[PDB]
Enzyme design. Structure first.
Site, PDB file in Angstrom:
ATOM      1  N   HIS A  52       0.848  -1.184   0.000  1.00  0.00           N
ATOM      2  CA  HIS A  52       0.000   0.000   0.000  1.00  0.00           C
ATOM      3  C   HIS A  52       0.886   1.236   0.000  1.00  0.00           C
ATOM      4  O   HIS A  52       2.029   1.191   0.464  1.00  0.00           O
ATOM      5  CB  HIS A  52      -0.891   0.078   1.243  1.00  0.00           C
ATOM      6  N   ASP A  55       2.153   1.879   3.412  1.00  0.00           N
ATOM      7  CA  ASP A  55       3.134   0.958   3.986  1.00  0.00           C
ATOM      8  C   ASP A  55       4.557   1.463   3.794  1.00  0.00           C
ATOM      9  O   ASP A  55       5.432   1.170   4.614  1.00  0.00           O
ATOM     10  CB  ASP A  55       3.081  -0.431   3.349  1.00  0.00           C
ATOM     11  N   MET A  86       2.699  -5.871  -8.060  1.00  0.00           N
ATOM     12  CA  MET A  86       1.374  -5.341  -7.771  1.00  0.00           C
ATOM     13  C   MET A  86       1.524  -4.269  -6.701  1.00  0.00           C
ATOM     14  O   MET A  86       2.400  -4.370  -5.838  1.00  0.00           O
ATOM     15  CB  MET A  86       0.428  -6.452  -7.279  1.00  0.00           C
ATOM     16  N   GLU A 179     -10.531  -6.466  -5.362  1.00  0.00           N
ATOM     17  CA  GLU A 179     -10.448  -7.530  -4.378  1.00  0.00           C
ATOM     18  C   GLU A 179     -11.730  -7.526  -3.556  1.00  0.00           C
ATOM     19  O   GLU A 179     -11.928  -6.607  -2.741  1.00  0.00           O
ATOM     20  CB  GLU A 179      -9.231  -7.326  -3.471  1.00  0.00           C
ATOM     21  N   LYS A 181     -14.658  -8.569  -0.728  1.00  0.00           N
ATOM     22  CA  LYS A 181     -14.743  -9.048   0.645  1.00  0.00           C
ATOM     23  C   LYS A 181     -16.178  -8.815   1.084  1.00  0.00           C
ATOM     24  O   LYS A 181     -16.720  -7.736   0.806  1.00  0.00           O
ATOM     25  CB  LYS A 181     -13.776  -8.301   1.571  1.00  0.00           C
ATOM     26  N   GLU A 215      -9.547 -13.452  -2.906  1.00  0.00           N
ATOM     27  CA  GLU A 215      -8.800 -13.949  -1.754  1.00  0.00           C
ATOM     28  C   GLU A 215      -9.477 -15.186  -1.195  1.00  0.00           C
ATOM     29  O   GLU A 215     -10.694 -15.190  -1.009  1.00  0.00           O
ATOM     30  CB  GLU A 215      -8.676 -12.897  -0.645  1.00  0.00           C
ATOM     31  N   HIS A 218     -11.806 -14.578   1.931  1.00  0.00           N
ATOM     32  CA  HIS A 218     -12.960 -13.696   1.758  1.00  0.00           C
ATOM     33  C   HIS A 218     -14.161 -14.436   1.185  1.00  0.00           C
ATOM     34  O   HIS A 218     -15.283 -14.308   1.696  1.00  0.00           O
ATOM     35  CB  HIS A 218     -12.573 -12.519   0.878  1.00  0.00           C
ATOM     36  N   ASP A 243      -5.080 -13.656  -4.145  1.00  0.00           N
ATOM     37  CA  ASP A 243      -4.600 -13.609  -2.766  1.00  0.00           C
ATOM     38  C   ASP A 243      -4.763 -14.989  -2.143  1.00  0.00           C
ATOM     39  O   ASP A 243      -5.882 -15.498  -2.041  1.00  0.00           O
ATOM     40  CB  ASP A 243      -5.390 -12.574  -1.962  1.00  0.00           C
ATOM     41  N   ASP A 253     -12.133 -12.272   9.486  1.00  0.00           N
ATOM     42  CA  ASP A 253     -11.109 -12.491   8.472  1.00  0.00           C
ATOM     43  C   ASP A 253      -9.794 -12.897   9.152  1.00  0.00           C
ATOM     44  O   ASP A 253      -9.132 -12.077   9.791  1.00  0.00           O
ATOM     45  CB  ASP A 253     -10.984 -11.208   7.663  1.00  0.00           C
ATOM     46  N   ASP A 255      -6.947 -14.490   7.852  1.00  0.00           N
ATOM     47  CA  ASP A 255      -5.703 -14.359   7.093  1.00  0.00           C
ATOM     48  C   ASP A 255      -4.628 -15.330   7.574  1.00  0.00           C
ATOM     49  O   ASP A 255      -3.472 -14.948   7.765  1.00  0.00           O
ATOM     50  CB  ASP A 255      -5.178 -12.928   7.147  1.00  0.00           C
ATOM     51  N   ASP A 285      -1.751 -12.895   0.969  1.00  0.00           N
ATOM     52  CA  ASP A 285      -2.300 -11.840   1.813  1.00  0.00           C
ATOM     53  C   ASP A 285      -2.632 -12.557   3.115  1.00  0.00           C
ATOM     54  O   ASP A 285      -3.730 -13.077   3.289  1.00  0.00           O
ATOM     55  CB  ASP A 285      -3.530 -11.174   1.187  1.00  0.00           C
TER      56      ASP A 285
HETATM   57 MG   LIG Z   1      -6.151  -9.261   0.253  1.00  0.00          MG
HETATM   58 MN   LIG Z   2      -8.371 -11.408   4.428  1.00  0.00          MN
END
Ligand SMILES: [Mg+2]
Ligand SMILES: [Mn+2]
Ligand SMILES: [Mg+2]
Ligand SMILES: [Mg+2]
Ligand SMILES: [Mg+2]
Ligand SMILES: [Mn+2]
Ligand SMILES: [Mn+2]
Ligand SMILES: [Mn+2]
Lengths: 386, 386, 386, 386
Positions: A52, A55, A86, A179, A181, A215, A218, A243, A253, A255, A285
């Site tokens: 991002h 980030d 990406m 993406e 969700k 993802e 998700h 993802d 979520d 992850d 991710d």
């Molecule tokens: Mg993601």
């Molecule tokens: Mn996630």
């Protein structure tokens, strides 16, 4: 099962860099310097990194501070051979985005959201990014009256159409990937699944520029079959990015690292991506659980790639097994590939063997032999046969 | 709250006619004669009825028996003024369809499936149906290897393309509506949500002929927000029909009467359908619980229409309330309707007030006043204010 | 991975005998004769069979017909060496049970329900059954007013107390096991999880006679961790029996074959049952998918036992691996087994090293090394190490 | 619908004081001073406040700072008449608790956890608290090997037994209430539902000291029926306290204001609590959405109490309606209250009218009239009849 850059494994800076702040807890790990993530990921065999804007460049930085962060980042990439395949925008962390970015009710936030995105697109392209991801994590609502969803979709289409106009006017060779969700952090998020995102793309001014970045967790947060949804995105020519991670069912979520969560779904996913020839980044991710020190962070990142390589080997064995080939024919998977009525509507309508002389009861009695097939796949996943 | 035929409430024959056979139990009610459902529904104020082929004509009937069933049905319609606004095919009950109709692995079942559908389309049109629904309840899989989903989507597109070729070659004034469902009776069903169905329609040869028939409980079986999904179908111009009922969350398909299940979601749904001017049938795909005798069947059908009429009144009061109008402006719903950048990409890019001179911290401090708005909606739903 | 009767695999008559009638479809398979299931299960290596009363004796049979069914059944058992370790009552299929058996609102149905149960207990004991299971599939409600749950729990306690009085007055050496399920076929079922059942047992007149028969898929239908719930039942001394099968998340009760569904949960379950020394039947409450012929029915039953034997081997390797033993110590699993304060409340209160001189920040920095541990378990499950 | 202190509405300091930090976002609101929450809650009509230790005394405070925080808090209570009916410990936010408090693998953290709890019990009692809540939000696991659940339950029983020994040795008039939650922030939390908590309490050394504090949204996060679970806790004599809020199904813990989420479940809950004579605090464990300013925080808190008062009025009307009384008799709710076999096991066994002369088919034909009953409840909830 050693990963090499040829395997195209990538990681977000925010993944191994996750400090472990969750809704009920403070950070359990110190912040990583983006340059140190690049180097340790390179050592593990990663192909590249993603980011991002926020980030890499702390929110509110001047152009002078912004430039210095990009410089040290770029040198780390040059020293390692690390790709940046990406990039994406953070339109969810800052309080200004509390009602959305592109679909915030306040018009001035929406304009701000677009300017912030456009600025990171420039950087992404200069850095080599082929795909620009948009996760609209704040686009949505907790209550029914807070958001007119038709207007919000107008505003969402307006935003992506303007991004498409920007990149084509600049001559950038980059595509967008939405993406999806279904929920979290909003009670319901707009474009909640792969399907809604695919349908929305068809109403954009230049649909060819847009695909999905699905993802694992998700789709699974809606109880959906992730392999099936990936098959529909591939069927539509829209799997631009993906993802990979793990999720245990319908809850927050998680992850988790790839392979954790729903293990058989991860096997069927790898089987599909490889037998379809998906050639994009295998991006993770994921979030090393906040119980872990930095040794656990790197062990969890390594486990991501390791589980992919193991499932790849098992899926290839499954497909290469002649017992499985013969089981596939016994289930009539080869007949699924045959056109139903390539002889045409007229021929089909004058075929008495398709309805008048159809022996419905003899057809009903055929077994599909799906369980024997599925036990062969289980045996291959578990390694009870090669 | 008396229902009149102007309210366009319709019911399937299979709804009030449900005998109560469930996976663990035998029927608790006798079969209704289709003619007697027409008459009792007319007495309740229903606008029309819908049917599967196999609801009206017992499977395996000769043309002579088929014709006699249609005759007595048609006389019941003529005597009552009952409309038949929608029809559909049963491609799921008979054992021959155990692996699907349009996407069965066996090519001969797929051909059979199309011939069975085409035959009921003729009847539907002759009877006055504007919409032909397809629920692919058997299209799917329990295990990952049983079904190549890309091939299955090819076969699904082939089937609907051939149906589109049939109806246009006949000059029929009828459109198709896909009814999505995520699971049950297959472990995962293809096109599992409104979104996947909308995306799939865009790859058909004549997309203008196809829309969706969403069902309250099916979207909710995936944890999705049904009003939001309806808003996306309306935004795309694809809400051809709708199934109204009730569902308590993520579990088996309950098909409760409308208003039961998620009561606030039913309020926001009615609010959307009425303020959008949806003019299609308000169809109830519901099942009187098998605890009920025939008195309970009709009380449950009447409750369907009653709850719609009550929510309609409450939603109209909510929107007509000047306190609510002022709450909507306080939440900036009116600004959501304003184009984000009608001044264009160039203007937006040279607007320093959108990024350079944007006071992000002052914008972050605005409250959206969503809770006050939502309490006003609650008060209106409950009748604590008119 | 060949199963022998020493492995204690058992099957219900209703499992391999499932004809494939589901809510939207007719049977796809012919009914099996109970005697033929006994023999084919014996050939596969099953240890025994279980049954509902109505699986063996058709509902409404006279004592003369009842006796003849039991006779031919008993001869099949004698010829094979087949055990009958568990039996249960069908209190859900017949329309009379549409509002429950033990907690039906109609008092006369409740009395009928108890007499029907008592009669099958006699048969169960005469046949050798150690465990009598109760699945209250109809005890519950679709709507909030239909059932006063406090009264219903009084009626449920009354029923089981009377069963306990019956078996102790007869001197039968049999215990009861409640099989929980959260929903389906009722909208909500009473005692919906292992926990509610365990709590309810504590209020019975003779709690020592009652335990639980948990089912993999039922707990998973509530999103719960099945191994954890099994650990709590073992901790309480209440795991009398267990139903093994597969389930893909929160949806209708799938009853897939064991190993399907959540594969890692099946591994952690086998690991727990074996390392705890569970010595009861490994019973499979599963349903061969209705896509299958009779070849698929037996392949699916065989796959149940095969997957258990494979997971058993992998779990034993995981625990026997010295790298895993050392990983367990690195995560401080051995310290979890140490009493927190065996020195007593007073000592703990005067221990300054437990609060006053506790270095909270140094303790916060320890990593739990859970990911390395979990990757070792993954490697063992997949066979990437022995 | 004005709330008065007689209505016993209470709020946690952490509720209206929630700054809006969520997993993907920074705080959107400034921290409230505990003294200012006391006063504004008093102005709204709240009966009292509750707190975690770390809400009132910043973690790491000296005894001198601790004492000064308690002083200013106590003066605010004295000036307002505010009660403090419940208190609890924060054993989840600090990184030291990342693997649990009472069931952390590290023995020294467990000892620390108990000392931290014991210290806040003293304060709670001195402040007037009748109930001490324990939410074990960190007790659990993301992966199967991280936690031996039998040992963890031993450690959990050890902790609560030591707390019970502490309070009885001090002569404190306080009871404990376990607050269950199925997941979040751990992948699976121990004692995940009301049922598991009730069962666990029965194995404590002094069970009479322990009950449950159930939360609307937590049970609903497992798809469970919250009214039913409350009925089981009341049936067992264990409803010591209750957390009221709103939740839309199976997803992250939303903590919406009471009345939001599942509106009919909130109606059936109020109906039960009032008709059962629950006399404990009506406590709101909720979170004003982070979209709101401080005006929205107080409007959301006020809406909590308002919706309870509205549902109370509607439930009382439902029960007081003679049409509803007559509907209850038509559904045989009064017969549910009658003992099934107060004539005894022998009498029941010699009653031919209960099995031999039982007309099963005539009983099967009775309708339960549940839908008419449920429509009357709907009408009362919506105010379509008084
Ligand atoms: Mg993601
Ligand atoms: Mn996630
Ligand atoms: Mg429908
Ligand atoms: Mg079972
Ligand atoms: Mg709480
Ligand atoms: Mn349905
Ligand atoms: Mn089951
Ligand atoms: Mn909560």
């Amino acid at each position: 099962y050693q990963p090499t850059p040829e395997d195209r494994f990538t990681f977000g800076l925010w993944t191994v860099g996750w400090q472990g702040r969750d809704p009920f807890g403070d950070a359990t790990r110190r912040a990583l310097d983006p340059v140190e993530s690049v180097r340790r990921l390179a050592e593990l065999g990663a192909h590249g990194v993603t980011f991002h804007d926020d980030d890499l460049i702390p929110f509110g930085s001047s152009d002078s501070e912004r430039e210095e962060h990009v410089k040290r980042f770029r040198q780390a990439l040059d020293d390692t051979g690390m790709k940046v395949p990406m990039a994406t925008t953070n339109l969810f962390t800052h309080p200004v985005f509390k009602d959305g970015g592109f679909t915030a009710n306040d018009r001035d936030v929406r304009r701000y959201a677009l300017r912030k995105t456009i600025r990171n697109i420039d950087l992404a392209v200069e850095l080599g990014a082929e795909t620009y991801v948009a996760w609209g994590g704040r686009e949505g609502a907790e209550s029914g009256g807070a958001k007119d969803v038709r207007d919000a979709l107008d505003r969402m289409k307006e935003a992506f159409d303007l991004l498409g106009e920007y990149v084509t006017s600049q001559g950038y060779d980059i595509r967008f990937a939405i993406e999806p969700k279904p929920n979290e952090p909003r009670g319901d998020i707009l474009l909640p699944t792969v399907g809604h995102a695919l349908a929305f793309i068809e109403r954009l001014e230049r649909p060819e520029l847009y695909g999905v970045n699905p993802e694992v967790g998700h789709e699974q947060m809606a109880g959906l079959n992730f392999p099936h949804g990936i098959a529909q995105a591939l069927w539509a020519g829209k799997l631009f990015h993906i993802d990979l991670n793990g999720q245990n069912g319908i809850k927050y979520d998680q992850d988790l690292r790839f392979g954790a969560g729903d293990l058989r779904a991860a096997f069927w996913l790898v089987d599909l991506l490889e037998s379809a020839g998906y050639s994009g980044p295998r991006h993770f991710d994921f979030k090393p659980p906040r119980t872990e020190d930095f040794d656990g962070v790197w062990a969890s990142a390594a486990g991501c790639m390791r589980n992919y390589l193991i499932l790849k080997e098992r899926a290839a064995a499954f497909r290469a097994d002649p017992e499985v080939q013969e089981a596939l024919r016994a289930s009539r998977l080869d007949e699924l590939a045959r056109p139903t009525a390539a002889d045409g509507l007229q021929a089909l309508l004058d075929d008495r063997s398709a309805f008048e002389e159809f022996d419905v009861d003899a057809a009903a009695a055929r077994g599909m032999a799906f369980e024997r097939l599925d036990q062969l796949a289980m045996d291959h996943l578990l390694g009870a046969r090669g």
